Write a protein that binds this ligand. Structure first.
Ligand SMILES: [Cu+2]
Ligand code: NA
Ligand code: NA
Length: 105
Protein backbone atom coordinates (compact mmCIF):
# COMPACT_ATOMS: atom_id res chain seq x y z
CA UNK A 1 0.00 0.00 0.00
CA UNK A 2 1.07 3.59 -0.52
CA UNK A 3 -0.63 5.10 2.50
CA UNK A 4 -1.58 4.18 6.03
CA UNK A 5 -4.63 5.34 7.96
CA UNK A 6 -4.05 6.92 11.38
CA UNK A 7 -7.76 6.72 12.24
CA UNK A 8 -10.33 4.59 10.40
CA UNK A 9 -13.08 6.85 11.72
CA UNK A 10 -13.35 10.62 11.34
CA UNK A 11 -12.24 12.61 14.39
CA UNK A 12 -12.49 16.09 15.95
CA UNK A 13 -10.95 18.91 13.90
CA UNK A 14 -9.76 20.44 17.17
CA UNK A 15 -7.31 17.57 17.66
CA UNK A 16 -5.33 18.68 14.63
CA UNK A 17 -2.17 20.52 15.66
CA UNK A 18 -1.70 24.03 14.32
CA UNK A 19 0.95 23.71 11.62
CA UNK A 20 -0.31 20.28 10.56
CA UNK A 21 -0.72 19.76 6.81
CA UNK A 22 -4.40 20.38 6.08
CA UNK A 23 -6.71 20.34 3.05
CA UNK A 24 -9.86 22.22 3.92
CA UNK A 25 -13.18 21.41 2.41
CA UNK A 26 -15.66 24.25 1.99
CA UNK A 27 -18.20 25.31 -0.60
CA UNK A 28 -18.10 21.95 -2.35
CA UNK A 29 -14.38 22.10 -3.15
CA UNK A 30 -11.13 20.72 -1.87
CA UNK A 31 -9.57 24.04 -1.03
CA UNK A 32 -6.06 22.80 -1.81
CA UNK A 33 -6.57 20.63 -4.88
CA UNK A 34 -2.89 19.93 -5.66
CA UNK A 35 -0.99 19.32 -2.49
CA UNK A 36 2.76 18.78 -2.38
CA UNK A 37 4.15 16.79 0.53
CA UNK A 38 7.20 14.63 1.26
CA UNK A 39 7.32 10.85 1.66
CA UNK A 40 6.19 10.06 5.19
CA UNK A 41 3.96 13.10 5.69
CA UNK A 42 0.45 13.00 7.19
CA UNK A 43 -2.25 14.84 5.27
CA UNK A 44 -5.50 15.72 7.05
CA UNK A 45 -8.73 16.73 5.33
CA UNK A 46 -11.03 18.86 7.43
CA UNK A 47 -14.65 19.39 6.51
CA UNK A 48 -15.65 22.99 7.20
CA UNK A 49 -19.30 22.69 6.25
CA UNK A 50 -22.47 20.72 6.97
CA UNK A 51 -22.63 18.82 3.68
CA UNK A 52 -20.75 15.55 4.37
CA UNK A 53 -17.69 14.88 2.18
CA UNK A 54 -14.96 12.26 2.02
CA UNK A 55 -11.84 11.49 0.03
CA UNK A 56 -11.88 8.52 -2.28
CA UNK A 57 -8.91 7.02 -4.11
CA UNK A 58 -10.01 4.46 -6.68
CA UNK A 59 -8.63 0.93 -6.83
CA UNK A 60 -5.01 0.80 -7.85
CA UNK A 61 -4.09 4.25 -6.56
CA UNK A 62 -3.02 3.82 -2.94
CA UNK A 63 -3.18 0.02 -3.19
CA UNK A 64 -4.86 -3.01 -4.75
CA UNK A 65 -8.15 -1.88 -3.23
CA UNK A 66 -9.94 1.44 -3.37
CA UNK A 67 -9.41 3.57 -0.32
CA UNK A 68 -12.78 5.12 0.34
CA UNK A 69 -12.62 7.41 3.35
CA UNK A 70 -15.47 7.77 5.83
CA UNK A 71 -17.98 10.56 5.39
CA UNK A 72 -16.96 13.60 7.46
CA UNK A 73 -19.56 15.89 9.00
CA UNK A 74 -18.90 19.54 9.92
CA UNK A 75 -15.63 20.10 11.76
CA UNK A 76 -14.56 16.49 11.34
CA UNK A 77 -11.16 15.41 10.07
CA UNK A 78 -9.64 12.40 8.34
CA UNK A 79 -5.98 11.70 7.73
CA UNK A 80 -3.80 9.62 5.50
CA UNK A 81 -0.07 9.11 5.81
CA UNK A 82 1.62 8.74 2.44
CA UNK A 83 4.41 6.21 2.41
CA UNK A 84 5.54 6.18 -1.23
CA UNK A 85 6.47 8.90 -3.71
CA UNK A 86 4.09 9.55 -6.59
CA UNK A 87 0.94 11.47 -7.48
CA UNK A 88 -2.45 10.27 -6.17
CA UNK A 89 -5.83 11.52 -7.41
CA UNK A 90 -9.00 11.40 -5.38
CA UNK A 91 -12.56 12.59 -5.39
CA UNK A 92 -15.56 12.90 -3.18
CA UNK A 93 -17.72 9.77 -3.43
CA UNK A 94 -21.13 11.44 -3.55
CA UNK A 95 -19.66 14.63 -5.13
CA UNK A 96 -17.65 13.33 -8.10
CA UNK A 97 -17.14 16.85 -9.44
CA UNK A 98 -14.96 17.47 -6.37
CA UNK A 99 -11.46 16.41 -7.28
CA UNK A 100 -8.00 16.81 -5.79
CA UNK A 101 -4.60 15.18 -5.73
CA UNK A 102 -1.63 14.68 -3.46
CA UNK A 103 1.87 14.90 -4.93
CA UNK A 104 4.28 12.92 -2.73
CA UNK A 105 7.97 13.59 -3.30
CU1 LIG B 1 -18.39 15.85 -1.12
NA1 NA C 1 -6.69 3.16 -3.71
NA1 NA D 1 -7.30 9.00 9.57
Amino acid sequence: DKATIPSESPFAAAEVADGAIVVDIAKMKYETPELHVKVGDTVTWINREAMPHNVHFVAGVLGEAALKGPMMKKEQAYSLTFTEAGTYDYHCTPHGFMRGKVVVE
